[PDB]
Model the fold of this input.
Amino acid sequence: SPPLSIMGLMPLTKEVAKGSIGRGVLPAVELAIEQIRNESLLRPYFLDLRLYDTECDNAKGLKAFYDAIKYGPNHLMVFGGVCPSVTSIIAESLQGWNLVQLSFAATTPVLADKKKYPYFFRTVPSDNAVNPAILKLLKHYQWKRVGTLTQDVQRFSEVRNDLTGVLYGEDIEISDTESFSNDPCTSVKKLKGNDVRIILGQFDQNMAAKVFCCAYEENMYGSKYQWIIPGWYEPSWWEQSRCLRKNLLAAMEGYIGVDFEPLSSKQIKTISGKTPQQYEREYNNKRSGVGPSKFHGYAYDGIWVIAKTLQRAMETLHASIQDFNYTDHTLGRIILNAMNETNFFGVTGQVVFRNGERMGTIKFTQFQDSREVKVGEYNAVADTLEIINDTIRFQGSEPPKDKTIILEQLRKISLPLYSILSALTILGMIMASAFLFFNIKNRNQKLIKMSSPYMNNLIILGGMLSYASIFLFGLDGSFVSEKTFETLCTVRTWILTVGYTTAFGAMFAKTWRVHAIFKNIKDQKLLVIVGGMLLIDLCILICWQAVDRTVEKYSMEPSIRPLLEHCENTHMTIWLGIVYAYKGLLMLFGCFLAWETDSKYIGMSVYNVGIMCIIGAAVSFLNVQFCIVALVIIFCSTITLCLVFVPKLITLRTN
Amino acid sequence: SERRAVYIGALFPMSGGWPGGQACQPAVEMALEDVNSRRDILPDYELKLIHHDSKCDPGQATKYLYELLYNDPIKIILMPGCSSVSTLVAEAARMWNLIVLSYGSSSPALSNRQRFPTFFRTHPSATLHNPTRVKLFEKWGWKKIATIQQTTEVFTSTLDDLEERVKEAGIEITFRQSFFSDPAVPVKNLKRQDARIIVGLFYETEARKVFCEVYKERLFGKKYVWFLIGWYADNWFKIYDPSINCTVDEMTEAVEGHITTEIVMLNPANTRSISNMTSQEFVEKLTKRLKRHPEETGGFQEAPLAYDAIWALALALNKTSRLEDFNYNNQTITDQIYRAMNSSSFEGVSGHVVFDASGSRMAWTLIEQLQGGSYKKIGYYDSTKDDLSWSKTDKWIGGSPPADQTLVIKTFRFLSQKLFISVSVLSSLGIVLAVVCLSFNIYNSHVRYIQNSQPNLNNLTAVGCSLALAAVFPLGLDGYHIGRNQFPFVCQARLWLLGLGFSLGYGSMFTKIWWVHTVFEPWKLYATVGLLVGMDVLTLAIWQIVDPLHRTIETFAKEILPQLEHCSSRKMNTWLGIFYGYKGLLLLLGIFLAYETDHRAVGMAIYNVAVLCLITAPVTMILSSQQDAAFAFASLAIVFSSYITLVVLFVPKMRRLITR
Done:
């Protein structure tokens, strides 16, 4: 039978880490070969795979290539996807012996050297496309604003290059793209600052140590995080010291990794009619030392697929014979023929070569620290991220948040104690109006001259103005939304303090003329004093009208929020010191006449109200707290008011 | 002896970065042939100069290579200058284990001593030059490193070597930027990175786009720094490209003085070679073999290293001065030559044949800022010491190799104003004050026929005046102003002002009894003033808590950088500030008490006095004291005029009444 010297050589020593398992898949492929031999399908092909476990020593592979040429017979093509270094060697070798061949195994998008990968090919490649699945996630996990980092191993560096590649048409906010070498906690902070909500990393299972470490540091185990990686970062690495072994498992929990979908889910009669179930049965079993090297599925796949393209070009060559040498450039043309023809309903999947690209899907698991829910496999056909429904072990129902939160508004009022407050304020003002109607409507025994004289009803009126204007501007609490934009409640407080200072100056000029006569009609002069008060008042009123205390403030809040509301004027303390001075103007004469000696207690209550205004400034520094503070302020205000009323009520007792 | 043709592993980079030495190879081979001719030293073999064209066919090159490995005879070495495929074979050697022979690869790639076992290539990283450039930085006094690079894998290796040196340097790697294609963005970032000490790495055309970006930024100044090396060509700078858009004039201007260099790329002098050839005669022979355009002379300067390597092979030969029993394996003579390699170092005519750690060359390094674009190679780093012959052609920052981190700002840490008018009026006031004190004392000691029978209040008046004088001394110009003694003075100053404030309100004490007289013995007003002093001591403890006053101030810049730490001065906890506000509150209390009420004329004087005190309160409130250098001490004169009115009262009719 016309033998088939095949370039059946790859790094497969027992020392060769998976290369041992490579031999562990050799037998299987050999079995496949034996199967093919059992098939004897493309006789007279007597498949003489010129075989050499290349043992992975770069120089060993060198001398291999060497003898392969010199001593080695007319072998066929790339038993490969083994040793990235010597891979590259082959990459160079691509057209070497007028050469051309293909592995299919390694994801090393180093393979991308279509320049070099002109005269060579491969199928199982870099899962950067998982981005699309991730896009599917961006669909399914419903995110569009994400950042990531990597321990940029020259691979993982190249991987991040591929990531940038994936950022092609990235119709979603690549909310960041960090990276790392070892500075996990450092980047951990950096990215907590990047509003940690989701995470993908290219790092060593080794590097994974510090990874999980910085993780448990942040530990933002919620929609404030996401775990994304690959079994490339070694299998059982989580199964494989800073973080809590608890928090370690926590990281392993929900750990969203992914790798190749090892084989066809429908474990049916393969494209080779092999019940892929029975296929794998025999695989593990006859394998008899393991299940074959992780590519076991892809391993025997490539076996049969070599065979496939083999029979394909076998037809294409029956078109023409077995005398090909390395000189046979036309045979290389026929190779390119079967190469363009690298496409079929491959067993593991309708294995075609989308620019050499394996036609497949990729298992995607969310490790719940052992529940590696390999739910998803982007059927590269559609990259149809076939997810095992309900396999989701999602912390919340949160499909990946895209760096979002919640606007926490400030505003703080009870509106009922405040309703009760407005009620009581109206009550005080109304009782004031009533008692005044009495005192005037009953002002016939105008029996006070050489005392608080019988004309103090005017002062009572000034007090009524005070207390009413107070009721209003205090009832100016929390729903100004009608205007709430320098809503002229400025003028509310303005008229408030106006009536206030009016009532104040009433007793002021009273005691003024009083102590004056006490040394050794004047209603006009007192009215003049109050008028000058109101004059400076309207002056500063226009002044702050130029300032023109829309309710605006600022704060962040939790349950995540941000508070902002307060009325503050352009005169940050200018008008403030102004009011302070206006007040001291009275408080002085107050304490003065207090020393001079009825209305002394009135001046006392006034100074009390001054201390109250101080507390109000404090509340301005202070929320609904400050709201109740203003409430208590108005309370003390009406309190001094009724206190004044009680002095008159003494006469009602006399009455 | 017997010129047994030794299989000489030769594939010329017929295509190559400089695929013209590929020819010069033959010429160097000619030289070698000349050597093979002048085999007198040890003719005991010839070269089976297995000649091929490297031809940049990297993969196919390697194919033919193997073919040679697959071919006779027992071969010698590499015909390499550039790495990639060579580098591959270099990794490969041990398997066959032959002479790692490039020359024109400074490639940090050379460093893989593990892999780079047989390494042999003249070109070496100018990082040492960079380190010499560090020395030059030293010669610049530069110690703060700002750099970037179009991230060539070359420039990658660079960035490493950079980092290598920077570590070895232990100098401030002030900035490590980079580039890939057009970092004009990162250029603006460097603007943001606040350019003072600049260097970058790219290729003549990458360099072209670079200079384009440069002229764009136009940030040319002693801030900017065109620190470079001879990776590109002069014309690559000097000649302009149509693909550009910037101002070849402006950019040209920028190009001048651009710092760069190149090692001594050939025999500097024309001495008779190791082959008794003049470097002149070298260039002669160059021209001789120059059968094509000397313009088209690829590896022209390299051809120097080429025939050099010819002679160098010859050196190893005459060292060995048959042993052919080596295979790609058989390692006896292999190790023999390996020793000869550990022994490989000489004095070649191109330069004292210098084996770097990996045998690479080493010699003086011409060093040329693009001196008016006539890059004056004013340095020659004798790699032995990298001893830069500093020919000092520097047309540079000051004409000068200035230092890195070009920024040196001032600070207005204080001021004095000479206290000129200040200290003047200060001495004047102290004089008049002591004068009035003695005058009243003379008026004192004998009288009873005045308002009462004792000017005990004159004492508290003098106390306030003493406070005034003391503060003139205390917060004057002898604690951080004219006199330079703060480290103690400022320290001692912590007390000075404080002390004086004590006597402040002394004279006002009478008011209390006057208030009592407003009601209308000495124990009453005595206890009153005692309580005043007690409040004073309370605030003094508050200050002792609120201490550390002689403090820093105040942020500002200045106009050769300038800053203004404007007048670092008395500054402590504003708690004591509020305490002073409270003291002034008590004062205003006294003020109103006066507003209430001879002794009446005395009280009117005291009213004017409280008015002056109110004035002083503003200067207090003028603590802002923007022009503090022109603000303080008006209140001292206030106190002066106050005590003046006091004595004016106490003088004439007071004598008439009390004494005479």
The domain at 6-124+271-357 of chain A is CATH 3.40.50.2300 (Rossmann fold). The radius of gyration of chain A is 45 Å.
